[PDB]
Design an enzyme around this catalytic site. Sequence first.
Site, PDB file in Angstrom:
ATOM      1  N   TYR A 214     -86.430 -37.596 -10.772  1.00 46.56           N
ATOM      2  CA  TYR A 214     -87.126 -36.278 -10.965  1.00 46.56           C
ATOM      3  C   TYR A 214     -88.644 -36.532 -11.157  1.00 46.56           C
ATOM      4  O   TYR A 214     -89.314 -37.748 -11.149  1.00 46.56           O
ATOM      5  CB  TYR A 214     -86.773 -35.892 -12.754  1.00 46.56           C
ATOM      6  CG  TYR A 214     -87.392 -36.858 -13.761  1.00 46.56           C
ATOM      7  CD1 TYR A 214     -86.796 -38.194 -13.973  1.00 46.56           C
ATOM      8  CD2 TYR A 214     -88.438 -36.513 -14.356  1.00 46.56           C
ATOM      9  CE1 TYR A 214     -87.463 -38.851 -14.787  1.00 46.56           C
ATOM     10  CE2 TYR A 214     -89.216 -37.311 -15.252  1.00 46.56           C
ATOM     11  CZ  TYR A 214     -88.581 -38.406 -15.627  1.00 46.56           C
ATOM     12  OH  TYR A 214     -89.128 -39.188 -16.566  1.00 46.56           O
TER      13      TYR A 214
ATOM     14  N   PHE B  54     -96.891 -34.075 -14.861  1.00 46.03           N
ATOM     15  CA  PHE B  54     -97.354 -35.316 -15.887  1.00 46.03           C
ATOM     16  C   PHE B  54     -96.382 -36.321 -16.134  1.00 46.03           C
ATOM     17  O   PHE B  54     -96.422 -37.350 -16.731  1.00 46.03           O
ATOM     18  CB  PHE B  54     -97.048 -34.349 -17.316  1.00 46.03           C
ATOM     19  CG  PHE B  54     -95.510 -34.106 -17.718  1.00 46.03           C
ATOM     20  CD1 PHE B  54     -95.196 -32.956 -17.238  1.00 46.03           C
ATOM     21  CD2 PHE B  54     -95.082 -34.953 -18.742  1.00 46.03           C
ATOM     22  CE1 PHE B  54     -93.683 -32.600 -17.703  1.00 46.03           C
ATOM     23  CE2 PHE B  54     -93.731 -34.738 -18.896  1.00 46.03           C
ATOM     24  CZ  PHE B  54     -93.077 -33.487 -18.428  1.00 46.03           C
ATOM     25  N   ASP B  55     -95.343 -36.154 -15.067  1.00 47.38           N
ATOM     26  CA  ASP B  55     -94.364 -37.167 -14.957  1.00 47.38           C
ATOM     27  C   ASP B  55     -93.694 -37.431 -13.551  1.00 47.38           C
ATOM     28  O   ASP B  55     -93.563 -36.419 -13.147  1.00 47.38           O
ATOM     29  CB  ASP B  55     -93.406 -37.316 -16.016  1.00 47.38           C
ATOM     30  CG  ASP B  55     -92.798 -38.620 -16.467  1.00 47.38           C
ATOM     31  OD1 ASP B  55     -92.439 -39.693 -15.264  1.00 47.38           O
ATOM     32  OD2 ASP B  55     -91.831 -38.793 -17.669  1.00 47.38           O
TER      33      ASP B  55
ATOM     34  N   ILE C  84     -84.598 -36.309 -23.754  1.00 51.11           N
ATOM     35  CA  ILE C  84     -85.193 -34.760 -24.448  1.00 51.11           C
ATOM     36  C   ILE C  84     -83.935 -34.205 -24.293  1.00 51.11           C
ATOM     37  O   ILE C  84     -82.946 -34.257 -23.470  1.00 51.11           O
ATOM     38  CB  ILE C  84     -86.335 -34.550 -24.036  1.00 51.11           C
ATOM     39  CG1 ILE C  84     -86.134 -34.199 -22.367  1.00 51.11           C
ATOM     40  CG2 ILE C  84     -87.468 -34.951 -24.434  1.00 51.11           C
ATOM     41  CD1 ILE C  84     -87.452 -33.457 -22.011  1.00 51.11           C
TER      42      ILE C  84
ATOM     43  N   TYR D 284     -90.003 -30.738 -27.133  1.00 46.37           N
ATOM     44  CA  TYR D 284     -90.999 -31.428 -28.069  1.00 46.37           C
ATOM     45  C   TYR D 284     -91.254 -30.800 -29.315  1.00 46.37           C
ATOM     46  O   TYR D 284     -91.834 -31.465 -30.031  1.00 46.37           O
ATOM     47  CB  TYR D 284     -92.402 -32.011 -27.358  1.00 46.37           C
ATOM     48  CG  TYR D 284     -92.166 -33.280 -26.590  1.00 46.37           C
ATOM     49  CD1 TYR D 284     -92.418 -34.360 -27.087  1.00 46.37           C
ATOM     50  CD2 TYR D 284     -91.757 -33.405 -25.383  1.00 46.37           C
ATOM     51  CE1 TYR D 284     -92.184 -35.617 -26.479  1.00 46.37           C
ATOM     52  CE2 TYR D 284     -91.623 -34.382 -24.449  1.00 46.37           C
ATOM     53  CZ  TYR D 284     -91.859 -35.497 -24.992  1.00 46.37           C
ATOM     54  OH  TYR D 284     -91.814 -36.568 -24.286  1.00 46.37           O
TER      55      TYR D 284
ATOM     56  N   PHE E  20     -88.628 -29.656 -14.730  1.00 50.06           N
ATOM     57  CA  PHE E  20     -88.381 -30.635 -14.268  1.00 50.06           C
ATOM     58  C   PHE E  20     -87.433 -30.463 -12.920  1.00 50.06           C
ATOM     59  O   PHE E  20     -86.678 -29.773 -12.959  1.00 50.06           O
ATOM     60  CB  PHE E  20     -87.525 -31.539 -15.024  1.00 50.06           C
ATOM     61  CG  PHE E  20     -87.947 -31.813 -16.405  1.00 50.06           C
ATOM     62  CD1 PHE E  20     -88.825 -33.172 -16.571  1.00 50.06           C
ATOM     63  CD2 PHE E  20     -87.864 -31.113 -17.567  1.00 50.06           C
ATOM     64  CE1 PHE E  20     -89.483 -33.447 -17.778  1.00 50.06           C
ATOM     65  CE2 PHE E  20     -88.529 -31.429 -18.773  1.00 50.06           C
ATOM     66  CZ  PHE E  20     -89.339 -32.648 -18.927  1.00 50.06           C
TER      67      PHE E  20
END
Lengths: 107, 430, 324, 181, 260, 184
Positions: free
Chosen positions: A26, A36-37, A56, A82, A99
């Site tokens: 991912y 961010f990831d 999550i 979050y 994602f």
Amino acid sequence: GVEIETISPGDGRTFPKKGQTCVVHYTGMLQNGKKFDSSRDRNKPFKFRIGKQEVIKGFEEGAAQMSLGQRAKLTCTPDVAYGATGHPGVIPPNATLIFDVELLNLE
Amino acid sequence: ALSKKVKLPTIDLPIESVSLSLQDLIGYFHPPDEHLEHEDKQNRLRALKNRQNLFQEEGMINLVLECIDRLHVYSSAAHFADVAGREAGESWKSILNSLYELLAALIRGNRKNCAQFSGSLDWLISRLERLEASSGILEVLHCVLVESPEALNIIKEGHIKSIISLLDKHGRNHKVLDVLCSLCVCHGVAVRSNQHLICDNLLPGRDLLLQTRLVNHVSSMRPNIFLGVSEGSAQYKKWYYELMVDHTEPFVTAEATHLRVGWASTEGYSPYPGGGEEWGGNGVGDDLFSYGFDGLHLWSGCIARTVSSPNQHLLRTDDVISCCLDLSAPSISFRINGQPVQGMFENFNIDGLFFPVVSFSAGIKVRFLLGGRHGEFKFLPPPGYAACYEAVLPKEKLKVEHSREYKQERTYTRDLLGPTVSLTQAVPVD
Amino acid sequence: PLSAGLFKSEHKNPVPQCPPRLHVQFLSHVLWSRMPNQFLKVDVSRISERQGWLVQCLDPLQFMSLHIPEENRSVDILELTEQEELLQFHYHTLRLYSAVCALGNHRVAHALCSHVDEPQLLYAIENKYMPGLLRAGYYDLLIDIHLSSYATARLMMNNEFIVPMTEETKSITLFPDENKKHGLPGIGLSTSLRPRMRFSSPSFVSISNDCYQYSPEFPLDILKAKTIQMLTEAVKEGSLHARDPVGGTTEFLFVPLIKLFYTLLIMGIFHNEDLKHILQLIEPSGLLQMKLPEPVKLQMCLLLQYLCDCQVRHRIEAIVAFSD
Amino acid sequence: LILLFSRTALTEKCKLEEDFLYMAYADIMAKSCHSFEEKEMEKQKLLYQQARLHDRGAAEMVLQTISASKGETGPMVAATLKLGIAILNGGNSTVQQKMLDYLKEKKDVGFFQSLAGLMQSCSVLDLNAFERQNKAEGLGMVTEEGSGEKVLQDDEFTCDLFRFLQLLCEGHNSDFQNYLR
Amino acid sequence: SLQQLISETMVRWAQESVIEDPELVRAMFVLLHRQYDGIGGLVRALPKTYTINGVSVEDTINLLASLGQIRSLLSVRMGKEEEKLMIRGLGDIMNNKVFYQHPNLMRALGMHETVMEVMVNVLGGGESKEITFPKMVANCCRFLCYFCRISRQNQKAMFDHLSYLLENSSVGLASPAMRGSTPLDVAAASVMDNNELALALREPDLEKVVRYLAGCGLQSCQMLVSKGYPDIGWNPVEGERYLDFLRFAVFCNGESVEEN
Amino acid sequence: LGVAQVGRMNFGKDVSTLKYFTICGLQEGYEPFAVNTNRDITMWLSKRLPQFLQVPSNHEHIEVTRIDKVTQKSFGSQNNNTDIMFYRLSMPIECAXXXXXXXXXXXXXXXXXXXXXXXXXXXXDSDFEVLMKTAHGHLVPDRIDKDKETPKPEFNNHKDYAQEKPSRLKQXXXXXXXXXXXXX
């Protein structure tokens, strides 16, 4: 709250069940497109069990509805990802997540 | 006597006297030049250290603090002039700057002074938003932070938030970053509280500081086709062409390959359409002068919109797409695997010479499909829509430039070109 | 309630003030563009077969770009060479990124990793047309976020020689010195107690990370191969003394590379053959014979100091092996 | 190297640091120095070995190192005094005159006051500590203390300091004899 | 052959050009002197070497990891979380078995000096106005107590630092929360049951302890008068602690030390 | 280079390809510009798209002041040739997923084009003003009930425009003919 937008079909036969582990690939990104990831940078897939409360909810509940080899765009909500506190340092509070997940293997 | 109430102006305000005195006192603490003998430099250092110690042991640092306190009760030179006179009003700014310079020079090097007056940091960081002496206050804060580690023990979350808000209000200053670096570590030792505060209050939102990202190099390909509709000579205002793919790889190195196809406009009636300047991650649809489609979304002005389609999927290998373009009443349309999509860019500017174009990043094998000797259609064009091999002007060759310029991987032997003309052609005699 | 109270931090202030950032910007024409030194190299079939027009693109090409948010604009990394202000501001930003995680603080390093990237650091340390200041800043950040913690943890225990009495330890009793050979520094067998290294994987989709106690994970084999290759290229470039060293002057080219190589050598990589090649980089009787600047020879001094520390440790281990 | 040591000693501080570099190099530079022809050749080679390093600034470096201690008995002065002994072995009038010209051309008190502070705290045989160590030996087989059984502290340092003060006045250097008073 | 080319290059650079940046020339010369002396490294490092066994490896590795964590937290300013990690690390080191099986190893590693320079940072800042991080003081105090307890030579090692902690031994008193961990108590533990150390305890500090006792017998505790005690004209707590330390200094093994 | 003019540059490094170096330059101590180089030159050029820049103080015929009750940023000019400018504020206003509307209210009420379409964008405030001999038209951040920017004009106000615009790079003198597209 999490939704799924298919990107490439994965024959929709094998689905993640309780008591298994999925290998995903991912590249997460914020709502404004700011990445961010990712797991393609470190060149190592992300292995995680289902129903063990380790990732999550917006990710696990979304992956539990995918198939092997199926690319999906999982749009999650701040309360399922979050909450009103976010991730200290990276994710601001009340932020939605996107994602680009691809399932490689389902064990 | 003037700031307490409205009193008769028989007061001694030595404006020029105190300005000259401050100008002399600032140079009285001037650090020695680096282009000096070592022994003389050490002697000057010892002299200024003894001077600063003697000036501290009389408590006049608090005196200049009271001075800048009594001077900060105004707002501007215009506010000070109509109360204390024109000269005093116009010199208030210079006097405050000189006072802040003197306050910084009194503490440039000492370790004892910072320890002694660190308790006044509650006032400096509060007045940091005076908008006229922020530079001086930041200088003073920097020299008091870089020297004494005990001043860092009283820096709370409010002060860090105030500094970050100053950085957000006054723009990109390279001084606030040095202040934050000095707040992170003082003398070979770190403060985890301040580090966590900086990390959690400075860059969770990414509006500041300057972000950065690693993107792919995308390019585009277009044939020698131009479509201009107006009164007079027209070209049926109807065109159509197909596109297939041989091999495709969704993630070649780190990101999904850019792969779009559509029609791009021009600027007036000339080449070089407007958009992403050159050599970026912008293909078709990333501007208001192009319209593209990539299998999932419709791109127009670097803004994607998802549209429904039977078995909507990315342009995997062995996928045939068909682009239709009518000019006047309807607009560009796409049909994936024959079945048309449920979206199109109606009511768009028709000014310009439209042309087909395909953008790709890497790992792609694309095939344009026309009629005749150039290719063979996979499906049936809708009634009226012609093709590009017929759109070509009679008795001219047809080739494929990239989009605008010399985006060719070549050595110095590149024919760099200047501006061009609008083809000199883009009615009988009376 | 206000215009300024919408695109700023505060919103509960209904007084219409104007911050210094609010300045009018006119559509200007004084602007330069940078022609890239590498293109996509698209090849047309040039045959125009009767079954379509073929275009092909196989080779990949990437580049990094800053994104000014309040202008909402992307600018290539290399364009900062002309602009003094963005250059200095991004240099100080990299310095702050290093300072917030300088010491052994990993809760901030795990955030900074995603804050910049995983492979952007590799691209920046490999790129040749870097502004120099940014090259140094990215090198220092790569050293700080990953290698710094374990480097200091291994350097603190560098003067304490704890050695077990294993049979593998009872094998260096010879410490080859006779028959007219002296061995090589750092080559041989250690059998010495040294702090183990382990790095956690940076993942932010996983709730409730256990401890993230040590460091973010980073691939070391690719890094060491790239370091060896770039050091060979750098010594080859410095041997001829051109007028365009990587990153501006020659210290910007050498110092960060030697620093990365030095901390890599500290942290316990470059096994026998790699260290042999690293030695033959400087030893043939090179790098110590060149005209190197002061910040370069200052790092060469630390390199030689470690080369002597390893020999001292080998001597102590041999002494224990014989004393057994 | 001598210039580095001199700059380190001249930099204003509040306490003379350890400086393992200086403590290691002063001993090397001191041990570098040291039937008629057999006694003349060595007497001339000693002058040559002293000229190998006292024309390069060691005569002033020793004075600066002594001045930068302001009267603190430590391993820094304990080595700079040995260096002064090695550099002033015999009646080296040229080195004596160089030191005197330096002290007169830089009117510094921090050297003479440092000498006074050093002399005020050199060593004294204390009877209480001696009888205490004797009783400790009688009670148990306690190992001997290295620094003169902890009854005479740095007797070698005291002898070196006074030998330095002697060599500074050796011969009949009346100029320095009056400058010390 | 390493010393050869190192000694060549170090002198060759200086002969080529005068060198600014004195740190460069300092590093160059320390490398040069190291190459020339050679045995200096051996005589400096052999006191710090150690060998244990082929079977006790995991225990000593965990010990070394805990000591590295202690040093890393030392390198950072003291806070709540830092205090917690220091306390946990001290607990692990006290629970490790090598701490008993090899007491010379701890001295060779300098654990006592590390704990002392950790405790001095907490005890600094103020003298009579703040004693913050009392658990942080107490854990180091009890660790030092146990370190000097399980030995004969660790007492001699801690007797060197005994001089320092007696100047700030007034902390941790007037409170029955730490009857163990205390700087005065670690002084007593270091000087306890050793005739040689009781003798070597000369008088630069007995007058200091007596002056502390006099000040305690002349002044009451402001902490106590704030807590609400009847404000007696003197203090019986710090005085009792000083008397206990003096008793430990004077009486040893059942026979009173004459000079003390 | 001018219109339809192509050329080529050679900074050296290719002495086998330099033609007239041996004819002149090789003997008088003259060197190629990129002879001792390991990589090519960046070869900067003049870009076409005229992006926005902040007003420099050393700029003729355009001066911008700043005053401060209410805060204003007045304009001024001294020139003999007239044109049209594209002044734009620095920080743009971003719109969330729900909010998507913009109303232009003149001296009277709100009467303008229905510009209310923005799912998630960032509009930058701007005014395109024609340059008269006296051009004192400026911008004032005001307040009535919400975010309000008043582009106060003066005499000769018939071709000056005032709106909010996203990233747009076009230099011309046109009222309409702006790019547009409605996705279905």
